[PDB]
């Protein structure tokens, strides 16, 4: 089961290897759109803060799970920032959790006065007033319970079928990393001109032992030109300098 | 953007009240994925044993300040510890130090941006239009004209509000080219 969009869940993913080819023979996805990284480069990177959001929405709302969108979900249930790094994955779940009488465990917020902020979780259960009339209970006329359930029936149209949406957001190459693509480590070579890739940070140069000491949280050193001058090796926590070959 | 970021540092000291003069910088202790619209806070103070009146407050001091969007120039030493900084909008001397990327300024005159007056209030003026636009006739019409003989009508003297359709119908396409959808409510149209 997926959480109601009005009360969506998020969990951290760490200390694991990401491999997206495993899903090719698992499910057919209607949406797989990446903004921070092109899909073909996903396997070459390593990520430092990876979270997975889990909620279920209506098919017509799939276009709203994107930066810069409007609508009932984008405005009142779940919104992405314009400065979004990640991938939005969605697929048709009509054959997974619909019910003949309607699956009423999936709810969304219909009425709110303010708009949501990125990654905001609005879980209030209070009655909201549409008019100026004060209310305490009442639950009608000019004030209503803000949540509604979707009529997710196996016989409805395509636009009304449930869809399962997973949004993967992350920080890329700016911190010590915990989730890497399907890569293997090799032996490190010093004092030679080497084409290197350190935790997703590539380049050409000569590696040497460094005389610098990084703070416990600092992973990379950068020069006055805003280029890498040193790296803390991801396999053994040594500080190495990198210099152009000629 | 949903993350509650806490920075911190501990310092040894021997003083009675006011914080010492000096300089230091805090470390990125924790980034919490919370997503809560925080507007107010309260402190938690320890209670010492001696009713609700026989309470011993012990001995402590607490300080509160507020953050502003301000540019700072940071000086790193040979070991990467920040040892000084220039507040780029504290005063003309600090402004000059920031402009030249230096903590030493030579004798002379330095031009440093401008004195700018900021607005004190927001003044919004629109025509006093009280009628709602006929969204019902447009979207709840009994019949639509054949595409070969399409109809057009002028809309005027009304207020546009697109949130009324959210609980009316589900739309497959809503694409705006002249204006981004999020700015539609901030404009006024002539034809």
């Amino acid at each position, epitope marked *: 089961r997926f959480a*109601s969009v009005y*009360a969506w869940n998020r969990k951290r993913i760490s200390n694991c290897v990401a491999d997206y080819s495993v899903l090719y023979n698992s499910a057919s996805f209607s949406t797989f759109k990446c903004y921070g990284v092109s899909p073909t480069k996903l396997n070459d990177l390593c990520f430092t803060n990876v979270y997975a959001d889990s909620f279920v929405i209506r098919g017509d709302e799939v276009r709203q799970i994107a930066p810069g969108q409007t609508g009932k979900i984008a405005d009142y249930n779940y919104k992405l920032p314009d400065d979004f790094t990640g991938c939005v994955i969605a697929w048709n779940s009509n054959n997974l959790d619909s*019910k*003949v*009488g*309607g*699956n*009423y*465990n*999936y*709810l969304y917020r219909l009425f709110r006065k303010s708009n949501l902020k990125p990654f905001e979780r609005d879980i209030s259960t209070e009655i909201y007033q549409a008019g100026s009339t004060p209310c305490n209970g009442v639950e009608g006329f000019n004030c209503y*319970f803000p*949540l*509604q*359930s979707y*009529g997710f*029936q196996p016989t*409805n*149209g395509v636009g*009304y079928q449930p869809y399962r949406v997973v949004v993967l957001s992350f920080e890329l190459l700016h911190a010590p990393a915990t989730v890497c693509g399907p890569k293997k480590s090799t032996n490190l070579v010093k004092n030679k001109c080497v084409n290197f890739n350190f935790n997703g940070l590539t380049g050409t140069g000569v590696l040497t032992e460094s005389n610098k000491k990084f703070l416990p949280f600092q992973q990379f050193g950068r020069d006055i030109a805003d280029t890498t001058d040193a790296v803390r090796d991801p396999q053994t926590l040594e500080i190495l300098d990198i210099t152009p070959c000629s | 953007d949903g993350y509650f970021k806490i920075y911190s540092k501990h310092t040894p000291i021997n003083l009675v009240r006011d914080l010492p003069q000096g300089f230091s910088a805090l470390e990125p202790l924790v980034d919490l994925p919370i997503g809560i619209n925080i507007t107010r806070f309260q402190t938690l103070l320890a209670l010492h044993r001696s009713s609700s009146s026989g309470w011993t407050a012990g001995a402590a001091a607490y300080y509160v300040g507020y953050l502003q969007p301000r540019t700072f120039l940071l000086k790193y030493n040979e070991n990467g510890t920040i040892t000084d900084a220039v507040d780029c909008a504290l005063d003309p001397l600090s402004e000059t130090k920031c402009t030249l990327k230096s903590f030493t300024v030579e004798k002379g005159i330095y031009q440093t941006s401008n004195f700018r007056v900021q607005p004190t209030e927001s003044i919004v003026r629109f025509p006093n239009i009280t009628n709602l636009c006929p969204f019902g006739e447009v979207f709840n019409a009994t019949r639509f004209a054949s595409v070969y003989a399409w109809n057009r009508k002028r809309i005027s003297n009304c207020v546009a509000d697109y949130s009324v359709l959210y*609980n*009316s*119908a589900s739309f497959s396409t809503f694409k705006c080219y002249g204006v981004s959808p999020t700015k539609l409510n901030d404009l006024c149209f002539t034809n």
Partner: antibody
Framework: QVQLLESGGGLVQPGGSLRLSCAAS????????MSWVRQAPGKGLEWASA????????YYADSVEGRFTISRDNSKNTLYLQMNSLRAEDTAVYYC??????????????????????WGQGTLVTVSS | DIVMTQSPLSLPVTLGQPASISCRSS???????????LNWFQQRPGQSPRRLIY???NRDSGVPDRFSGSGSGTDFTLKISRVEAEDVGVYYC?????????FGQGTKLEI
């Protein structure tokens, strides 16, 4: 099959109280909403009360609100209704029924659309000195 | 509340002939998602009511295949292809689109 067995039938003096209950089997009790309905002799049927599968959110018909209490105990798959301050108008055959809509831990009553799929055998209570 | 008027109050219709029962609502029974929630139930004397037609026209499971529904908006009709002896009893229309849930007064079919 799905089975609901009504009990608590009989007669109680005006102003008193009685408790009705429905046993259930052949169904996942906690996964669906359940309601109490009734019909006075010679009259059609009306809804009295409902609870979601979780046993939390409740609903009462306005004509009986306050006077009636509806409850569920998932550990015994048993639905209960206790009717206090009994009136002559409360003489009726009572039934339990199971809603077609799926309604679990996150489901709220009054958001359910559709009708009952399963109806019980029924039991009658009257009000008489 | 939804108010439903059924017609006729009783239907003394000859065995073996087509028949129909009308259910006219005070308000539309079509939900904005296109899903209707009008339910036709048959209560025979001595029996607890059992649903016959759901969502205006859909046939339920385990019921005679001689019945189907029809209609839209505020006026719906149950159509009976042939009257059978088992049809004697009272038919009710339940309106599931809004709360409180309501029923019509019922149509008593007789041969």
């Amino acid at each position: 099959q799905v089975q609901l067995l009504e009990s608590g039938g009989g007669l109680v003096q005006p102003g008193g109280s009685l408790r009705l209950s429905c046993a259930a089997s052949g169904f996942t009790f906690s996964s669906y909403a359940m309601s109490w309905v009734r019909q006075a002799p010679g009259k059609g049927l009306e809804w009295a009360s409902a609870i979601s599968g979780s046993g939390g959110s409740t609903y009462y018909a306005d004509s009986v609100e306050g006077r009636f209490t509806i409850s569920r105990d998932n550990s015994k798959n048993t639905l209960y209704l206790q009717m206090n301050s009994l009136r002559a108008e409360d003489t009726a055959v009572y039934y339990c029924a199971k809603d077609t809509g799926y309604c679990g831990d996150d489901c709220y009553i009054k958001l359910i659309r559709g009708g009952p799929d399963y109806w019980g055998q029924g039991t009658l209570v009257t009000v008489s000195s | 509340d939804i108010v439903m008027t059924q017609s006729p109050l009783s239907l003394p219709v000859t065995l073996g002939q087509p028949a129909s029962i009308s259910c006219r609502s005070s308000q539309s029974l079509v939900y904005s998602d296109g899903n209707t929630f009008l339910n036709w139930f048959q209560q025979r004397p001595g029996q607890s009511p059992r649903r016959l037609i759901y969502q205006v026209s859909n046939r339920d499971s385990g019921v005679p295949d001689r019945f189907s529904g029809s209609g839209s908006g505020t006026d719906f009709t149950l159509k009976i292809s042939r009257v059978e002896a088992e049809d004697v009893g009272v038919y009710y229309c339940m309106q599931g689109t809004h709360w409180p849930r309501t029923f019509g007064q019922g149509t008593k079919l007789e041969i």
